[PDB]
Amino acid sequence: PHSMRYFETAVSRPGLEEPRYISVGYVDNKEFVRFDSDAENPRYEPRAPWMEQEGPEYWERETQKAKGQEQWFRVSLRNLLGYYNQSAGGSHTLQQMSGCDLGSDWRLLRGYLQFAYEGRDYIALNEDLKTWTAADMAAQITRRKWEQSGAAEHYKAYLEGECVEWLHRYLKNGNATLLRTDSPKAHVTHHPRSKGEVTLRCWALGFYPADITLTWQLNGEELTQDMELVETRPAGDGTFQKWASVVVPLGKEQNYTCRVYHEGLPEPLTLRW
């Protein structure tokens, strides 16, 4: 199953400074394009190599859209102020996530469209691409406005047709590239003892995509109790890292095995100290 999303943000600036708008496109969770109003030359720029294959007609068309959306947020961000009795100039943030999933049959699975004011949900388009879910009494004014204008129907179109159409295309442009996988280079480290206990840390470094599974076991039985794990983190070079640790009762070091499961691995790794 495949998908495409566009995370957009418009953050209000303290002063008379026009709100900063930023848009990021994502194909199969990989950022592929990006627009930012702060740039000297605000334009939608390639964010993945398989995207450079697009001609100027594309980049100008997309940039036009981003500049229209830029003003769309300037207004709505202005309206939310009223809706929420907010003042003249403070820090205000509005973001929207839209896109579409494609099942295994390459036919539309789900379409998305949702907003959030100040990091909290505001209004989402239900899976029927017709009705809305307003989060609070404020979002009621917008929903009723969007029910009046028949806004939902116009997002149903983009979602079922243009989003689906264009995802099929980027998927074709980024074949092997999006499907590439870098295998983790694992290793285990040893750390000083607390009278009657030593820490065993299993490291998995240099992998892509981010999804990885690390496990510490004892004599075969997986010990999940008191296992320390870090949230997967980017190395900064496009790969990810992570580690699993267990404060092990010394002497019994070799009694512990670590497995690493990653899509890039031909066989899951097993390691020990």
């Binding site: 939608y44 859209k65 959306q69 309206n79 809706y83 839209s98 969007w146 116009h154 243009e162 159409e165």
Partner: peptide, 9 residues
Amino acid sequence: FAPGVFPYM
């Protein structure tokens, strides 16, 4: 292909 025209909030 990015989002387009739409009614305000």
